[PDB]
């Protein structure tokens, strides 16, 4: 039933309670565990989807069992019971984005799971209205280098309707542009959002690092297509700290990560579109986007430029290559004054956080392939922690691409 | 699609299915509730189902299935667990057998060599001293003067009543770990307790920080004996940096062969609480987890002050810069020495041979993503961007309470 959780660097032990919580199937089975795979292959469910929602905002404000606590489960059962669906109120939506934060199995930087600026966009008609409305998403969460964690939530999905919906990936991308040989200029992971671009109307540019334009659908209302002022995206010109040659490289990198694809569940009422944004930990730009072999995959130049020996794995030119440039991601955003947390001090971070979930509710799902950065895994205290994996409720779920 | 595991490289966007899965006769720790994958330690009758299941994969393997020779292999085996309680397997089962749960490890990398092992049939062996006589000659052809050969070593089965065989180390080399005064570790922490048993039991312990442990081999209902291993059989490798003159001076060494000595081997539903397995290192095992892991040798803080980094902040990543220098260190020395050794690049990319050699022949391949990405450049490895579905085959390798 209830899980041992151990540290082997500690060799502290915990058992993790909450995950009976868990109200979702995961993939894996007695037989054979999937925990590796990146994606997963009526009114009486919704409503006791959104009893247990009340329940847990209530509980979370104390006041579980009052007259408000059941004023407001006889208005939900009401609004179901009539309409098929009901709504949130403003407050309650604010708790359970956060809670799908705090919930979020892959992510480590839930130590700040508390501290979210929640926008309401409920009252938003058209991709015109929504184009605002992330436009100020942007500009507040970037805050002039001093990003700040927020989260932006569009229209409910709704039955028969479309739902609304943010073409991206992430508010802000680089393009890429097939050219000639199959080969890519830009963005490889960005080909295909690209190209859909173009053929509504973009005018593409040709270089290595373009921020393409948004595509915001409204419901039923084929996808229109925004550019987004220059000044609201800040990046940043990465520089190593001792290379003088690596800033003729022209790498650079945008500063806010804001998923836009994703779905917030709360309550069973599903979010198609409510991008979000904290802030970058270095590895995911020095090591993920600059050194995949199916993304700029740098790793090479970088490497002829150290003039290392490419010629043999064993001389290890690639781990040599791949710190340097993580390096030169940490110093360039310090530089530029821009919020930032290597590996190191966002691992520690959540380790703090797992205890302080550990006494919070009997324990915190965690996907450890996930948790554990892509460079330097055992010398960060997470690689060393057992963790359990179960979905809860509030989350942010994947959902398929609208075309 | 198909109604098995689909599984997705993320790097080359090819697909497969895992339908070998199937084959799969044992439950892991995981549910539709709650994934497990991360955690290190999640009857006549059924003698008999696990032994008929055995001798069908044996005699698959020799493409003979259904043959006469097949059906009165199975004919046997009834035949002896109805008058013993058990039964034997042949020389050649004994074998196939071994390779396969090398084969079936789910935690191994090294997997695309399971075809070449040696297999040493030792189930003669009748005494402690014996034992030791078995594990020297497995070390000594093991080792091959650095040019290492896999190879395991196969003691007697656990019998009805009688005492197991059993080694107590957990592996057939390992370096002392002595608790001191103070309360800090001198040697190898992760074998405090071991080197405390080997002391309660008579040994004269050294003071050094590597301190080859002496054996502690247990026959049937006997207490242990203990055997102390000639220097000449353990090759070691002092570690000098390519670069770093000064590293050769910090004094460090690792023995070039790995041996695991704890682990039960079960075939058919015989269980060899004995089988010491060896094969050849990954740089990483040595350079990051025994020498950079927190509660191991912990010299990341002594090598990044000889680099001169600046250990007060974590953004300067003295941590990664050093944990580099250090697996290159290893890298460096076994070449030197000429001892083998693969690093965690071309191992990794073997591996990915394996699959794909796995993916024909059976149909998948069970691995543990968190064992077979190595502790440091994860993403720089293929593997990294490869899924894996894992399940537990039969014959394999599985833990076992220590015999104390
Ligand atoms: C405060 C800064 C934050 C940091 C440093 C952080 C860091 C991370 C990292 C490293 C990942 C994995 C990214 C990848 O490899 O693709 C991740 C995933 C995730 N984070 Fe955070 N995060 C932060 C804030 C947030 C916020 C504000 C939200 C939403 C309210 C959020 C929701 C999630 C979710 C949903 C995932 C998993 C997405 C997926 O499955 O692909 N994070 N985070
Ligand atoms: C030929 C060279 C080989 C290489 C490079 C190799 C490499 C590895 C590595 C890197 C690990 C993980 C070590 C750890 O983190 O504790 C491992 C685990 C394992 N290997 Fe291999 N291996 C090889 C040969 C063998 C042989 C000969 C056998 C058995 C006949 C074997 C059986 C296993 C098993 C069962 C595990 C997991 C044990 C556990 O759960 O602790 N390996 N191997
Ligand atoms: N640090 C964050 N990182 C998000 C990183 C998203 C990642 N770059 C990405 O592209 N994810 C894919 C999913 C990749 N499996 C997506 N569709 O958004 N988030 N944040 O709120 O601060
Ligand atoms: N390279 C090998 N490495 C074996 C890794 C052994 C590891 N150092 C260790 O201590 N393993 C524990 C098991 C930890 N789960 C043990 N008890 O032997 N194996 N080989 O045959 O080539
Ligand atoms: C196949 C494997 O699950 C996949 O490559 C995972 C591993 N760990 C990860 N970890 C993070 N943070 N982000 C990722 O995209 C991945 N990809
Ligand atoms: C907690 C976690 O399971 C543990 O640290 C695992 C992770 N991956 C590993 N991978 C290998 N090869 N060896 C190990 O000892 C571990 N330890
Ligand atoms: C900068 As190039 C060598
Ligand atoms: C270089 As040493 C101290
Ligand atoms: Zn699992």
Redesign the interface.
């Known amino acids: 039933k209830f899980?041992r959780?151990?540290n082997?660097?500690?060799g502290s032990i915990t058992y993790?309670t909450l995950?009976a919580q868990?109200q979702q199937?995961?993939?894996?089975?007695?037989?054979?565990?999937?925990?590796?795979?990146?994606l997963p292959?009526p009114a009486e469910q919704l409503l006791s989807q959104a009893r247990d929602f009340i329940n847990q905002y209530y509980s979370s404000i104390k006041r579980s069992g009052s007259q408000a606590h059941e004023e407001r489960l006889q208005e939900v059962e009401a609004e179901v019971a009539s309409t098929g669906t009901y709504h949130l109120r403003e407050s309650e939506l604010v708790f359970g984005a956060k809670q799908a934060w705090r919930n979020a199995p892959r992510c480590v930087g839930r130590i700040q799971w508390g501290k979210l600026q929640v926008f309401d966009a409920r009252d938003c008609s058209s991709a015109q209205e929504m184009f605002t409305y992330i436009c100020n998403h942007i500009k507040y969460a970037t805050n002039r280098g001093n990003l700040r964690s927020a989260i932006t939530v569009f229209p409910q999905r709704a039955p028969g309707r479309g739902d609304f919906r943010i073409w991206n990936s992430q508010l802000v991308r680089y393009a890429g542009y097939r050219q000639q040989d199959g080969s890519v200029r830009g963005d490889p992971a960005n080909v295909e959002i690209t190209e859909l671009c173009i053929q509504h109307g973009w005018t593409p540019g040709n270089g290595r690092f373009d921020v393409l334009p948004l595509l915001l659908q409204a419901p039923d209302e084929a996808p229109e297509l925004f550019v987004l002022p220059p000044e609201l995206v800040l990046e940043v010109p990465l520089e190593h700290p001792t290379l003088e040659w690596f800033a003729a490289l022209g790498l650079r990198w945008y500063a806010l990560p804001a998923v836009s694809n994703m779905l917030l569940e709360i309550g069973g009422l599903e979010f198609s579109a409510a991008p979000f944004s904290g802030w970058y930990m270095?590895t995911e730009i020095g090591?993920?986007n600059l050194?995949?072999?199916?993304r700029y995959n740098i790793?090479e130049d970088v490497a002829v430029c150290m003039d290392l020996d490419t010629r043999t794995?064993?001389?290890?030119w690639?781990?040599?290559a791949?710190?340097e440039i993580?390096?030169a991601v940490?110093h360039s955003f310090?530089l530029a004054k821009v919020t930032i947390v290597?590996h190191?001090?966002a691992t520690?971070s959540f380790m703090k956080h797992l205890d302080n979930e550990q006494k919070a509710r009997g324990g915190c799902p965690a996907?450890?392939?996930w948790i554990?950065?892509?460079?330097?895994?055992?010398?960060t205290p997470v690689?060393?922690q057992?963790?359990?994996?179960?979905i809860l409720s509030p989350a942010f779920r994947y959902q398929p691409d609208p075309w």
């Not at 050194?291 to 199916?294: K, L, M, V």
């Not at 794995?313 to 290890?316: R, V």
């Not at 554990?372 to 010398?379: A, D, H, Q, R, T």
């Open positions: 899980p959780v151990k082997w660097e500690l993790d995950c868990s199937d995961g993939p894996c089975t007695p037989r054979r565990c999937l925990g590796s795979l990146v292959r270095s090591t993920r050194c995949d072999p199916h790793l794995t064993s001389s290890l690639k781990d040599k791949a710190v993580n390096l940490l310090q290597d190191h001090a520690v996907d450890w392939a554990v950065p892509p460079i330097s895994g055992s010398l690689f060393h057992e963790m359990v994996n179960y």
